[PDB]
């Protein structure tokens, strides 16, 4: 999160820190959020050989009672995900065990198929990514305000599509998401409306987020049969 602020400790109990072993066998990390006791939502480009889920944390370097580290039982990257174009970048992770909805851990309601967000609205991105281009991933959970822009502000991204994606972040500001924030939710009025997908290497906004409402039917099917 760039230009953000540190979140209040355990104020967003649905946030998940993901440690990934990529298919290329590289060690990586992403953000994510719990939408049901045994299902975490995140970005498809965070898929891999194995994945661990850490819930109930604020500072990933400080172990606390609220900590709940769960293994991922099954990965559900969107069937139409395209790594080259980075399209349909959304994934559902079924946990080996159900998380305990006690203190520090809770779920996050997601947007309805026809309850999406209109340009102009100010939402909040939340993740564990880098606080800047050459800065390290933040130990503490961060959050920053970002405005939804008209799809035209993202025409410089040759593979962008307003239907399944969102154009977020006033280009005149530094506020934005970056490496490590993928899978994190974009909230507007306490509801997850998007998922951080990709950004510009120099961190200049806006950025692209997966529009959750567009995949509501697919998400429901997974949660229905699992």
């Amino acid at each position: 999160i760039i230009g953000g602020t540190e979140c209040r400790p355990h104020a967003r109990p649905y946030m998940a820190y993901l440690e990934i072993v990529t298919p290329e066998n590289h060690l990586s990390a992403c953000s994510g959020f719990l939408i049901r006791r045994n299902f975490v939502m995140t970005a498809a480009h965070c898929a891999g050989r194995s994945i661990t889920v850490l819930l109930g944390a604020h500072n990933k370097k400080v172990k606390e009672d609220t900590w709940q580290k769960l293994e991922v039982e099954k990965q559900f990257p969107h069937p139409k995900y395209d790594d080259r174009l980075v399209l349909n970048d959304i994934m559902l992770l079924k946990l080996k065990e159900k998380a305990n909805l006690t203190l520090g851990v809770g779920t996050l309601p997601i947007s309805a198929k026809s309850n999406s967000i209109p340009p102009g609205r100010v939402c909040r991105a939340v993740g564990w990514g880098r606080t800047n281009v050459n800065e390290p991933p933040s130990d503490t959970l961060q959050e920053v305000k970002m405005r939804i822009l008209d799809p035209q502000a993202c025409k410089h991204f040759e593979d962008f599509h307003q239907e399944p994606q969102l154009c977020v972040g006033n280009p005149k500001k530094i506020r934005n998401v970056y490496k490590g924030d993928s899978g994190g939710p974009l909230l507007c009025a306490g509801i997850a409306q998007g998922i951080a997908s990709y950004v510009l290497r120099n961190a200049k906004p806006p950025s692209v987020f997966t529009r959750i409402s567009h995949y509501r039917p697919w998400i429901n099917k997974i949660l229905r049969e699992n």
């Binding site: 980075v86 991204f157 993928s182 997908s197 990709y198 510009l200």
Partner: peptide, 4 residues
């Protein structure tokens, strides 16, 4: 672009 770069996928985060």
């Amino acid at each position: 672009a770069a996928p985060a």
